[PDB]
């Protein structure tokens, strides 16, 4: 059972992680890289320019089996019950 | 326009851009992105997610660096009353 | 009561307890804590914060473990429409 | 300039940390331990019991010089521009 620092390194290397203390079961978080995509309308082209850079982010597979954008809570940050998920 | 977050949230859900006077970075705004469903790209993805992936709606921020971050309001964001709609 | 977060937020600011049907833990609720000002406890604290410390209002969660966590809504919390006032 | 994992260890040891990439200047975050306090009214005594345990948390000294409860953003989590603050 790892602290968040080790779970973070795991995330950045492409692994999945979860916490034993989470109330929902079978969930995991994972890293998604950033990228660039093309502005497709002049309305979007005006707001964001011709091509748009987006930052990397983290995602969570929820108990509903859909994907949420995810930010650890302070309890998640401070916990030492993280595990890498196969 | 000095809106509270409830009114900024209604604006977000209606597809408008919002920002706060009290943010330290300037020229930023947040906006809503709908959820959806994409087919799994690789067999390694299929082994974890199945054939399809449903993703929830989320919020995005156009940052001072003019790139796009995923965004969740801070507590100070949530409690503030200096929100405005951005054109 | 199937409130959106704007209505749950109004309730929080009025001093009520709120929770979500869609939370995984049960029997939890969030509530508002006002800001304030406390004198600095030690000289080491005074060297960093001065004589007084002003702290902002914040939100708290009574967890399944029945202890109190500081709390910030998730994006799913913010976008949900299954909020209720708790007695 | 550290990643968040090292900034987290610093926090847990009682140090102050900040990020070079923060828009506001002169800010820092720090760790606050948990504790117990007594329920003072029967209204509170009924809701939370006779004595209340509260978890540790993180705080931020903001540009307004007041203290906010603080959760790192995903950009904070993923950044590698953390520094310990004297
Ligand atoms: N549908 C969804 N969309 C977006 N994110 C979702 C999600 N479902 C789960 N997550 C995220 O996955 C992690 C653990 O999931 P889980 O513990 O099952 O969450 P829950 O029971 O529904 O929490 C009820 C309230 O307490 C917050 N919270 C603060 N720390 C915790 C962990 C643990 N309980 C503890 O106390 O240490 C919870 C939480 O955000 C919510 O407002 C956590 O990052 C959580 O945000
Ligand atoms: N009064 C206050 N109450 C409570 N927490 C406060 C606070 N003031 C600052 N903080 C916290 O201190 C950290 C850095 O402070 P700062 O960067 O100056 O925040 P800002 O410019 O006002 O952000 C405008 C929007 O973008 C979010 N955001 C996401 N990552 C970042 C960092 C950096 N910009 C990046 O993009 O990597 C910002 C941010 O939450 C807000 O919704 C950050 O954890 C932030 O939440």
Short mmCIF file of C-alpha atoms and ligand atoms in Angstrom, two decimals:
data_model
loop_
_atom_site.label_atom_id
_atom_site.label_comp_id
_atom_site.label_asym_id
_atom_site.label_seq_id
_atom_site.Cartn_x
_atom_site.Cartn_y
_atom_site.Cartn_z
CA UNK A 1 0.00 0.00 0.00
CA UNK A 2 1.58 3.17 -1.36
CA UNK A 3 1.39 6.85 -0.60
CA UNK A 4 0.17 9.23 -3.28
CA UNK A 5 3.71 10.09 -4.40
CA UNK A 6 4.29 6.54 -5.61
CA UNK A 7 0.77 6.37 -7.05
CA UNK A 8 1.58 9.57 -8.96
CA UNK A 9 4.76 8.11 -10.49
CA UNK A 10 2.69 5.05 -11.47
CA UNK A 11 0.09 7.30 -13.13
CA UNK A 12 2.74 9.15 -15.14
CA UNK A 13 4.12 5.81 -16.38
CA UNK A 14 0.69 4.80 -17.66
CA UNK A 15 -0.54 2.54 -14.86
CA UNK A 16 -3.95 2.43 -13.13
CA UNK A 17 -4.29 3.12 -9.38
CA UNK A 18 -6.99 2.98 -6.73
CA UNK A 19 -7.39 3.41 -2.98
CA UNK A 20 -8.48 0.77 -0.47
CA UNK A 21 -10.33 3.47 1.48
CA UNK A 22 -12.61 4.51 -1.40
CA UNK A 23 -16.31 3.96 -0.67
CA UNK A 24 -17.11 2.79 -4.19
CA UNK A 25 -15.47 -0.47 -5.27
CA UNK A 26 -13.78 -1.46 -8.51
CA UNK A 27 -12.78 2.11 -9.45
CA UNK A 28 -9.41 3.23 -10.76
CA UNK A 29 -7.71 6.40 -11.96
CA UNK A 30 -5.38 6.81 -14.93
CA UNK A 31 -3.40 9.45 -16.84
CA UNK A 32 -4.40 10.91 -20.22
CA UNK A 33 -1.77 12.81 -22.27
CA UNK A 34 -2.30 16.27 -23.71
CA UNK A 35 -2.53 17.10 -27.38
CA UNK A 36 -3.60 19.40 -30.20
CA UNK A 37 -6.81 19.44 -32.25
CA UNK A 38 -8.00 21.66 -35.09
CA UNK A 39 -10.59 24.41 -34.69
CA UNK A 40 -13.45 23.33 -36.92
CA UNK A 41 -15.67 26.43 -37.05
CA UNK A 42 -14.75 30.09 -37.40
CA UNK A 43 -16.63 30.62 -34.13
CA UNK A 44 -14.22 28.20 -32.45
CA UNK A 45 -11.37 29.55 -34.59
CA UNK A 46 -12.00 33.05 -33.21
CA UNK A 47 -12.30 31.95 -29.57
CA UNK A 48 -9.32 29.56 -29.41
CA UNK A 49 -7.27 30.22 -32.55
CA UNK A 50 -6.78 27.87 -35.48
CA UNK A 51 -5.49 24.89 -33.46
CA UNK A 52 -5.98 24.20 -29.77
CA UNK A 53 -3.51 22.69 -27.31
CA UNK A 54 -5.04 20.80 -24.37
CA UNK A 55 -3.18 19.80 -21.22
CA UNK A 56 -2.86 16.25 -19.89
CA UNK A 57 -5.38 15.30 -17.22
CA UNK A 58 -6.49 12.44 -14.96
CA UNK A 59 -9.60 10.26 -15.35
CA UNK A 60 -11.58 7.94 -13.07
CA UNK A 61 -13.51 4.80 -14.03
CA UNK A 62 -16.51 5.25 -11.71
CA UNK A 63 -18.85 2.70 -10.10
CA UNK A 64 -21.31 3.51 -12.91
CA UNK A 65 -18.70 2.29 -15.43
CA UNK A 66 -18.37 5.68 -17.13
CA UNK A 67 -15.31 7.96 -17.20
CA UNK A 68 -15.11 11.15 -15.14
CA UNK A 69 -12.41 13.78 -15.12
CA UNK A 70 -10.78 13.37 -11.78
CA UNK A 71 -8.90 15.39 -9.17
CA UNK A 72 -7.76 13.62 -5.99
CA UNK A 73 -9.39 14.83 -2.79
CA UNK A 74 -7.25 15.95 0.14
CA UNK A 75 -7.97 12.60 1.79
CA UNK A 76 -6.78 10.90 -1.43
CA UNK A 77 -3.63 13.05 -1.45
CA UNK A 78 -2.79 12.27 2.17
CA UNK A 79 -3.71 8.56 2.15
CA UNK A 80 -1.27 5.67 2.24
CA UNK A 81 -3.59 2.91 0.96
CA UNK A 82 -2.95 3.28 -2.80
CA UNK A 83 -2.51 0.18 -4.96
CA UNK A 84 -1.56 -0.31 -8.60
CA UNK A 85 -4.37 -2.00 -10.53
CA UNK A 86 -3.76 -4.66 -13.20
CA UNK B 1 -21.70 40.86 -13.56
CA UNK B 2 -21.30 39.86 -9.88
CA UNK B 3 -23.11 36.52 -10.11
CA UNK B 4 -22.90 33.79 -7.52
CA UNK B 5 -21.77 30.33 -8.55
CA UNK B 6 -25.31 29.05 -8.91
CA UNK B 7 -25.90 31.57 -11.68
CA UNK B 8 -22.50 30.92 -13.22
CA UNK B 9 -23.31 27.20 -13.15
CA UNK B 10 -26.64 27.76 -14.95
CA UNK B 11 -24.68 29.72 -17.55
CA UNK B 12 -22.14 26.90 -17.91
CA UNK B 13 -24.88 24.31 -18.45
CA UNK B 14 -26.44 26.58 -21.12
CA UNK B 15 -23.14 26.62 -23.02
CA UNK B 16 -21.83 30.04 -21.99
CA UNK B 17 -18.32 31.06 -20.93
CA UNK B 18 -17.78 32.29 -17.38
CA UNK B 19 -14.98 33.80 -15.32
CA UNK B 20 -14.26 35.47 -11.99
CA UNK B 21 -12.95 38.98 -11.32
CA UNK B 22 -11.04 37.49 -8.36
CA UNK B 23 -8.99 35.03 -10.40
CA UNK B 24 -5.27 35.85 -10.42
CA UNK B 25 -4.74 34.98 -14.08
CA UNK B 26 -6.58 37.27 -16.49
CA UNK B 27 -8.39 36.60 -19.75
CA UNK B 28 -9.40 33.10 -18.64
CA UNK B 29 -12.81 31.49 -18.86
CA UNK B 30 -14.47 28.17 -18.04
CA UNK B 31 -16.98 26.25 -20.17
CA UNK B 32 -18.97 23.02 -20.23
CA UNK B 33 -18.22 19.99 -22.41
CA UNK B 34 -20.95 17.35 -22.92
CA UNK B 35 -20.45 13.68 -22.26
CA UNK B 36 -20.40 11.03 -24.93
CA UNK B 37 -19.36 7.58 -26.08
CA UNK B 38 -16.29 6.58 -28.10
CA UNK B 39 -15.29 3.14 -29.39
CA UNK B 40 -12.20 1.60 -27.80
CA UNK B 41 -9.09 2.34 -29.88
CA UNK B 42 -6.92 -0.73 -29.20
CA UNK B 43 -7.39 -4.28 -27.99
CA UNK B 44 -5.47 -3.33 -24.84
CA UNK B 45 -8.11 -0.66 -24.25
CA UNK B 46 -10.88 -3.17 -25.00
CA UNK B 47 -9.47 -5.49 -22.33
CA UNK B 48 -10.04 -2.79 -19.70
CA UNK B 49 -13.06 -0.87 -20.97
CA UNK B 50 -14.97 -3.23 -23.25
CA UNK B 51 -16.14 -2.26 -26.72
CA UNK B 52 -17.35 1.24 -25.82
CA UNK B 53 -16.38 3.91 -23.33
CA UNK B 54 -18.99 6.30 -21.93
CA UNK B 55 -17.52 9.55 -20.59
CA UNK B 56 -19.32 12.05 -18.40
CA UNK B 57 -19.70 15.76 -19.11
CA UNK B 58 -16.93 17.87 -17.64
CA UNK B 59 -15.71 21.44 -17.27
CA UNK B 60 -12.77 23.05 -19.09
CA UNK B 61 -10.66 26.16 -18.50
CA UNK B 62 -8.94 28.31 -21.13
CA UNK B 63 -5.81 29.18 -19.14
CA UNK B 64 -3.47 32.17 -19.27
CA UNK B 65 -1.20 29.99 -21.46
CA UNK B 66 -4.17 29.81 -23.91
CA UNK B 67 -4.24 26.01 -23.65
CA UNK B 68 -7.18 24.03 -22.26
CA UNK B 69 -7.15 22.39 -18.84
CA UNK B 70 -9.78 20.22 -17.25
CA UNK B 71 -11.23 22.24 -14.45
CA UNK B 72 -12.98 21.87 -11.12
CA UNK B 73 -13.99 24.97 -9.11
CA UNK B 74 -12.15 25.62 -5.89
CA UNK B 75 -14.12 26.22 -2.70
CA UNK B 76 -13.32 29.91 -3.05
CA UNK B 77 -14.65 29.74 -6.62
CA UNK B 78 -17.82 28.05 -5.37
CA UNK B 79 -18.41 30.63 -2.59
CA UNK B 80 -17.51 33.76 -4.63
CA UNK B 81 -19.99 36.34 -5.89
CA UNK B 82 -17.83 38.01 -8.56
CA UNK B 83 -18.66 35.71 -11.50
CA UNK B 84 -19.44 37.07 -14.95
CA UNK B 85 -20.54 35.77 -18.34
CA UNK B 86 -17.85 36.20 -21.00
CA UNK B 87 -18.63 36.95 -24.65
CA UNK C 1 -35.28 16.45 -3.02
CA UNK C 2 -33.60 16.39 -6.47
CA UNK C 3 -32.00 19.84 -6.26
CA UNK C 4 -29.25 21.06 -8.52
CA UNK C 5 -26.01 22.31 -7.00
CA UNK C 6 -27.09 25.94 -7.16
CA UNK C 7 -29.93 25.15 -4.78
CA UNK C 8 -27.73 22.96 -2.61
CA UNK C 9 -25.21 25.82 -2.49
CA UNK C 10 -27.89 28.30 -1.36
CA UNK C 11 -28.79 25.81 1.36
CA UNK C 12 -25.14 25.48 2.42
CA UNK C 13 -24.74 29.26 2.69
CA UNK C 14 -27.91 29.40 4.83
CA UNK C 15 -26.39 26.90 7.27
CA UNK C 16 -28.19 23.74 6.19
CA UNK C 17 -26.80 20.23 5.68
CA UNK C 18 -26.84 18.75 2.18
CA UNK C 19 -26.08 15.42 0.52
CA UNK C 20 -26.42 13.56 -2.77
CA UNK C 21 -28.35 10.37 -3.51
CA UNK C 22 -25.54 9.46 -5.94
CA UNK C 23 -22.76 9.47 -3.35
CA UNK C 24 -21.27 6.01 -2.76
CA UNK C 25 -20.92 6.43 1.01
CA UNK C 26 -24.24 6.76 2.84
CA UNK C 27 -25.32 8.89 5.78
CA UNK C 28 -22.90 11.69 4.82
CA UNK C 29 -23.62 15.39 4.58
CA UNK C 30 -21.77 18.61 3.78
CA UNK C 31 -22.05 21.95 5.60
CA UNK C 32 -20.62 25.47 5.59
CA UNK C 33 -18.16 26.86 8.13
CA UNK C 34 -17.71 30.66 8.39
CA UNK C 35 -14.37 32.38 8.16
CA UNK C 36 -12.70 34.15 11.02
CA UNK C 37 -9.54 35.47 12.65
CA UNK C 38 -7.33 33.80 15.25
CA UNK C 39 -4.24 35.15 17.00
CA UNK C 40 -0.96 33.46 16.13
CA UNK C 41 -0.12 30.72 18.65
CA UNK C 42 3.69 30.75 18.64
CA UNK C 43 6.48 33.12 17.69
CA UNK C 44 7.38 30.74 14.86
CA UNK C 45 3.83 31.21 13.58
CA UNK C 46 4.12 34.99 14.04
CA UNK C 47 7.25 35.00 11.89
CA UNK C 48 5.23 33.62 8.96
CA UNK C 49 1.73 35.00 9.51
CA UNK C 50 2.12 38.14 11.62
CA UNK C 51 0.07 38.81 14.72
CA UNK C 52 -3.27 37.62 13.31
CA UNK C 53 -4.41 35.03 10.80
CA UNK C 54 -7.57 35.56 8.76
CA UNK C 55 -9.09 32.34 7.42
CA UNK C 56 -11.74 32.10 4.72
CA UNK C 57 -15.04 30.26 5.02
CA UNK C 58 -14.88 26.66 3.88
CA UNK C 59 -16.97 23.53 3.41
CA UNK C 60 -16.89 20.39 5.57
CA UNK C 61 -18.05 16.80 5.09
CA UNK C 62 -19.25 14.39 7.77
CA UNK C 63 -17.79 11.18 6.30
CA UNK C 64 -18.86 7.55 6.57
CA UNK C 65 -16.21 7.23 9.31
CA UNK C 66 -18.20 9.93 11.21
CA UNK C 67 -15.15 12.22 11.28
CA UNK C 68 -15.02 15.62 9.57
CA UNK C 69 -13.08 16.26 6.38
CA UNK C 70 -12.58 19.51 4.54
CA UNK C 71 -14.54 19.23 1.37
CA UNK C 72 -14.66 20.54 -2.17
CA UNK C 73 -17.36 19.32 -4.60
CA UNK C 74 -16.26 17.18 -7.49
CA UNK C 75 -17.30 18.11 -11.01
CA UNK C 76 -19.86 15.31 -10.86
CA UNK C 77 -21.11 16.80 -7.58
CA UNK C 78 -21.36 20.22 -9.22
CA UNK C 79 -23.27 18.91 -12.28
CA UNK C 80 -25.61 16.52 -10.40
CA UNK C 81 -29.33 17.08 -9.83
CA UNK C 82 -29.89 14.60 -6.98
CA UNK C 83 -29.05 16.89 -4.05
CA UNK C 84 -31.19 17.02 -0.93
CA UNK C 85 -31.39 18.97 2.32
CA UNK C 86 -30.65 16.80 5.37
CA UNK C 87 -32.34 17.30 8.74
CA UNK D 1 12.24 22.17 -8.82
CA UNK D 2 10.38 19.14 -7.50
CA UNK D 3 7.46 17.04 -8.60
CA UNK D 4 4.38 16.84 -6.40
CA UNK D 5 5.53 13.60 -4.76
CA UNK D 6 8.49 15.36 -3.16
CA UNK D 7 6.35 18.40 -2.35
CA UNK D 8 3.92 16.02 -0.61
CA UNK D 9 6.64 14.49 1.58
CA UNK D 10 7.73 18.04 2.44
CA UNK D 11 4.15 18.94 3.41
CA UNK D 12 3.83 15.89 5.68
CA UNK D 13 7.07 16.90 7.44
CA UNK D 14 5.68 20.34 8.17
CA UNK D 15 7.27 22.42 5.42
CA UNK D 16 5.72 25.06 3.13
CA UNK D 17 5.63 24.58 -0.66
CA UNK D 18 4.66 26.58 -3.73
CA UNK D 19 4.75 26.32 -7.51
CA UNK D 20 6.67 28.53 -9.93
CA UNK D 21 3.80 28.23 -12.41
CA UNK D 22 1.15 29.69 -10.08
CA UNK D 23 -0.41 32.91 -11.40
CA UNK D 24 -0.56 34.56 -7.99
CA UNK D 25 2.80 35.28 -6.35
CA UNK D 26 3.99 34.81 -2.79
CA UNK D 27 1.55 31.98 -2.01
CA UNK D 28 2.35 28.74 -0.22
CA UNK D 29 0.58 25.59 0.97
CA UNK D 30 1.07 23.75 4.25
CA UNK D 31 -0.24 20.78 6.23
CA UNK D 32 -2.57 21.01 9.24
CA UNK D 33 -2.94 17.97 11.55
CA UNK D 34 -6.27 16.47 12.56
CA UNK D 35 -7.71 16.48 16.04
CA UNK D 36 -10.66 16.22 18.41
CA UNK D 37 -12.90 18.95 19.85
CA UNK D 38 -15.87 18.84 22.22
CA UNK D 39 -19.47 19.23 21.12
CA UNK D 40 -20.65 22.37 22.90
CA UNK D 41 -24.42 22.30 22.36
CA UNK D 42 -26.88 19.43 22.54
CA UNK D 43 -27.81 20.32 18.95
CA UNK D 44 -24.19 19.68 17.95
CA UNK D 45 -24.02 16.79 20.43
CA UNK D 46 -26.93 15.09 18.65
CA UNK D 47 -25.59 15.66 15.13
CA UNK D 48 -21.93 14.69 15.71
CA UNK D 49 -21.84 12.94 19.10
CA UNK D 50 -20.19 14.20 22.26
CA UNK D 51 -16.71 14.76 20.77
CA UNK D 52 -15.79 15.23 17.13
CA UNK D 53 -12.74 13.94 15.29
CA UNK D 54 -11.58 16.02 12.32
CA UNK D 55 -9.16 14.85 9.64
CA UNK D 56 -5.90 16.58 8.71
CA UNK D 57 -6.12 18.92 5.74
CA UNK D 58 -4.07 21.30 3.58
CA UNK D 59 -4.19 25.12 3.61
CA UNK D 60 -3.06 27.87 1.23
CA UNK D 61 -1.83 31.37 2.12
CA UNK D 62 -3.51 33.29 -0.73
CA UNK D 63 -2.53 36.54 -2.49
CA UNK D 64 -5.09 38.27 -0.24
CA UNK D 65 -3.05 37.14 2.80
CA UNK D 66 -5.87 35.01 4.21
CA UNK D 67 -5.96 31.22 4.62
CA UNK D 68 -8.02 28.98 2.35
CA UNK D 69 -8.57 25.25 2.57
CA UNK D 70 -6.71 23.89 -0.38
CA UNK D 71 -6.80 20.96 -2.78
CA UNK D 72 -4.15 20.81 -5.55
CA UNK D 73 -5.50 21.10 -9.07
CA UNK D 74 -4.64 18.47 -11.67
CA UNK D 75 -2.09 20.89 -13.12
CA UNK D 76 -0.62 21.24 -9.60
CA UNK D 77 -0.53 17.45 -9.21
CA UNK D 78 1.22 16.91 -12.55
CA UNK D 79 3.65 19.85 -12.35
CA UNK D 80 7.38 19.62 -11.75
CA UNK D 81 8.03 23.22 -10.66
CA UNK D 82 7.44 22.83 -6.90
CA UNK D 83 9.78 24.51 -4.42
CA UNK D 84 10.07 24.37 -0.65
CA UNK D 85 9.47 27.79 0.91
CA UNK D 86 11.47 29.12 3.87
N1 LIG E 1 -18.97 9.77 -9.96
C1 LIG E 1 -17.68 10.37 -9.67
N2 LIG E 1 -17.27 11.45 -10.34
C2 LIG E 1 -16.11 12.02 -10.09
N3 LIG E 1 -15.31 11.54 -9.15
C3 LIG E 1 -15.66 10.45 -8.44
C4 LIG E 1 -16.86 9.82 -8.69
N4 LIG E 1 -16.94 8.77 -7.85
C5 LIG E 1 -15.84 8.75 -7.11
N5 LIG E 1 -15.05 9.76 -7.46
C6 LIG E 1 -13.74 10.09 -6.93
O1 LIG E 1 -13.11 8.99 -6.76
C7 LIG E 1 -12.45 9.07 -5.40
C8 LIG E 1 -13.01 8.19 -4.49
O2 LIG E 1 -14.34 7.82 -4.81
P1 LIG E 1 -15.37 7.65 -3.52
O3 LIG E 1 -14.60 7.54 -2.24
O4 LIG E 1 -16.22 6.43 -3.74
O5 LIG E 1 -16.38 8.98 -3.56
P2 LIG E 1 -17.83 9.22 -2.79
O6 LIG E 1 -18.03 8.17 -1.73
O7 LIG E 1 -18.99 9.30 -3.75
O8 LIG E 1 -17.60 10.66 -1.96
C9 LIG E 1 -18.66 11.52 -1.47
C10 LIG E 1 -17.97 12.93 -1.32
O9 LIG E 1 -16.85 12.83 -0.70
C11 LIG E 1 -15.64 13.24 -1.69
N6 LIG E 1 -14.48 12.41 -1.37
C12 LIG E 1 -13.33 12.84 -0.90
N7 LIG E 1 -12.48 11.83 -0.72
C13 LIG E 1 -13.09 10.72 -1.05
C14 LIG E 1 -12.48 9.30 -0.99
C15 LIG E 1 -12.77 8.52 0.29
N8 LIG E 1 -14.21 8.41 0.45
C16 LIG E 1 -12.18 9.23 1.50
O10 LIG E 1 -12.94 9.82 2.32
O11 LIG E 1 -10.93 9.24 1.70
C17 LIG E 1 -14.37 11.08 -1.47
C18 LIG E 1 -16.12 13.03 -2.89
O12 LIG E 1 -15.43 13.80 -4.01
C19 LIG E 1 -17.59 13.39 -2.77
O13 LIG E 1 -17.87 14.72 -2.91
C20 LIG E 1 -12.72 10.55 -4.93
O14 LIG E 1 -11.57 11.34 -5.51
C21 LIG E 1 -13.81 10.83 -5.45
O15 LIG E 1 -14.02 12.29 -5.65
N1 LIG E 2 -8.22 32.42 -3.29
C1 LIG E 2 -7.92 31.00 -3.39
N2 LIG E 2 -8.65 30.09 -2.76
C2 LIG E 2 -8.40 28.80 -2.86
N3 LIG E 2 -7.39 28.37 -3.59
C3 LIG E 2 -6.60 29.23 -4.25
C4 LIG E 2 -6.83 30.59 -4.16
N4 LIG E 2 -5.88 31.20 -4.91
C5 LIG E 2 -5.10 30.27 -5.43
N5 LIG E 2 -5.53 29.07 -5.04
C6 LIG E 2 -4.94 27.77 -5.36
O1 LIG E 2 -3.67 27.91 -5.32
C7 LIG E 2 -3.12 27.21 -6.54
C8 LIG E 2 -2.57 28.10 -7.46
O2 LIG E 2 -3.10 29.41 -7.34
P1 LIG E 2 -3.32 30.22 -8.77
O3 LIG E 2 -2.57 29.56 -9.89
O4 LIG E 2 -2.87 31.65 -8.60
O5 LIG E 2 -4.98 30.24 -9.04
P2 LIG E 2 -5.86 31.20 -10.06
O6 LIG E 2 -4.95 31.88 -11.04
O7 LIG E 2 -6.76 32.15 -9.33
O8 LIG E 2 -6.74 30.08 -10.97
C9 LIG E 2 -7.95 30.37 -11.71
C10 LIG E 2 -8.65 28.96 -11.86
O9 LIG E 2 -7.82 28.08 -12.27
C11 LIG E 2 -7.62 26.95 -11.11
N6 LIG E 2 -6.23 26.49 -11.15
C12 LIG E 2 -5.83 25.27 -11.44
N7 LIG E 2 -4.51 25.18 -11.38
C13 LIG E 2 -4.03 26.36 -11.07
C14 LIG E 2 -2.53 26.70 -10.89
C15 LIG E 2 -1.85 27.29 -12.12
N8 LIG E 2 -2.56 28.48 -12.53
C16 LIG E 2 -1.87 26.28 -13.27
O10 LIG E 2 -2.63 26.47 -14.26
O11 LIG E 2 -1.12 25.26 -13.25
C17 LIG E 2 -5.13 27.20 -10.91
C18 LIG E 2 -7.94 27.57 -10.00
O12 LIG E 2 -8.36 26.66 -8.85
C19 LIG E 2 -9.06 28.52 -10.41
O13 LIG E 2 -10.30 27.97 -10.44
C20 LIG E 2 -4.37 26.50 -7.18
O14 LIG E 2 -4.45 25.17 -6.49
C21 LIG E 2 -5.32 27.26 -6.89
O15 LIG E 2 -6.63 26.58 -6.86
#
